[PDB]
Amino acid sequence: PPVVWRTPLEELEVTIRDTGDFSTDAAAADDLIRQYRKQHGFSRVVAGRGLQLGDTLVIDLEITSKATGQALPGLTHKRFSFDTEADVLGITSGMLGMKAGESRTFNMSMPEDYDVEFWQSMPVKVAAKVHEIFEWTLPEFNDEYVAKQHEGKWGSAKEMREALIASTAMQRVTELDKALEDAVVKAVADALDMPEVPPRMVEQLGERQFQAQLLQMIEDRIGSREDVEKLATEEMAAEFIRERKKDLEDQVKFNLAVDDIWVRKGLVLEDEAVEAEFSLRARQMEAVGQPFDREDMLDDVRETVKSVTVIEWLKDNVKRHVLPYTA
């Protein structure tokens, strides 16, 4: 129960990289402008050539777990429309050169930033059949295009570019705030003498995270409730916990460390904050029609609210070093 601070909490520092600069935002705005224009683009069936970056297409898609052969819900479709240049999946690289009629099975890691948290970095097999391929010429980007096609939003080509640059730069700011939370959490985890993290505590947290992400899937309607509950297998749950063992141990060290700091810095739980987090958790559990132990939820709601309060504290009294972006 007593925590051993190898490196003191007073001499504790995080370091994070800025994740872009002006020329990165401008590039990204230019790519958003291209996607707006492609909604007003001219299309033609491609012939005597295979799929290239820039094309759009219609495909049969089937994406399955490598470990379990389970189909990822949301990602089986007979006539999926798809732009190579707005590719949330990363399936483009593995499809270049395909032609109408051709099929392909190929291995891939799901993206690390995928919206559906369950599937981040998961090794996956993609089966794809291409029904048809389309290429595009875009209208020129000038004030006339802006006035004809996005009127009332922007009064100029310049206005639109500036708007989209600001929005991309505002997104780096909130991504960076998140990397700070993660760095501050990895800081405390790393600044502890604990050669072995209590191992039921890693499994228990693995299991809670597993459930929280299955629930996020049902409430965000990213696949049928019956399909999502078909991935709630022991095999899937094993695979999830193992492929995050390091992340889960760091997270337990932090939770134990959070229990130390709470006494040391004399922090006080506000009952209104615990009841706000509990009711939020209880709504979720109702909408998905599932029972829970009130007391066990309460230990978990209390763990989460403390964690939120110690992260806020660390954020405003830990030594920040922000490194800058480089090519």
Residue numbers in the entry: 140 to 466
Provide the publication's sentences verbatim.
Prokaryotic cells and the chloroplasts of plant cells possess the ribosome-associated chaperone trigger factor, which binds nascent polypeptides at their exit stage from the ribosomal tunnel. The structure of bacterial trigger factor has been well characterized and it has a dragon-shaped conformation, with flexible domains responsible for ribosome binding, peptidyl-prolyl cis–trans isomerization (PPIase) activity and substrate protein binding. Chloroplast trigger factors (hereafter referred to as TIG1s) display a remarkable sequence variance compared with prokaryotic TFs, while the typical organization of the three domains remains conserved.
Here, the crystal structure of the plastidic trigger factor from the green alga Chlamydomonas reinhardtii is presented at 2.6 Å resolution. Due to the high intramolecular flexibility of the protein, diffraction to this resolution was only achieved using a protein that lacked the N-terminal ribosome-binding domain. The resulting atomic structure of CrTIG1 lacks the first 137 amino acids of the mature protein (without the chloroplast signal peptide) and will be referred to here as CrTIG1ΔRBD. Visible electron density starts with amino acid Val138 at the beginning of the linker region between the N-terminal RBD and the middle PPIase domain, with β5 being the first secondary-structure element. The protein resembles the dragon-like structure described for bacterial trigger factors, but without the tail (the RBD). The PPIase domain, which forms the head of the dragon-like structure, is prominently tilted downwards in CrTIG1ΔRBD towards the arms. The C-terminal domain of CrTIG1 stands out by its unique features and differently arranged arms, which are not found in bacterial trigger factors. Comparison of both chains in the asymmetric unit of the crystal structure shows differences in the position of arm 1 but smaller differences in arm 2.
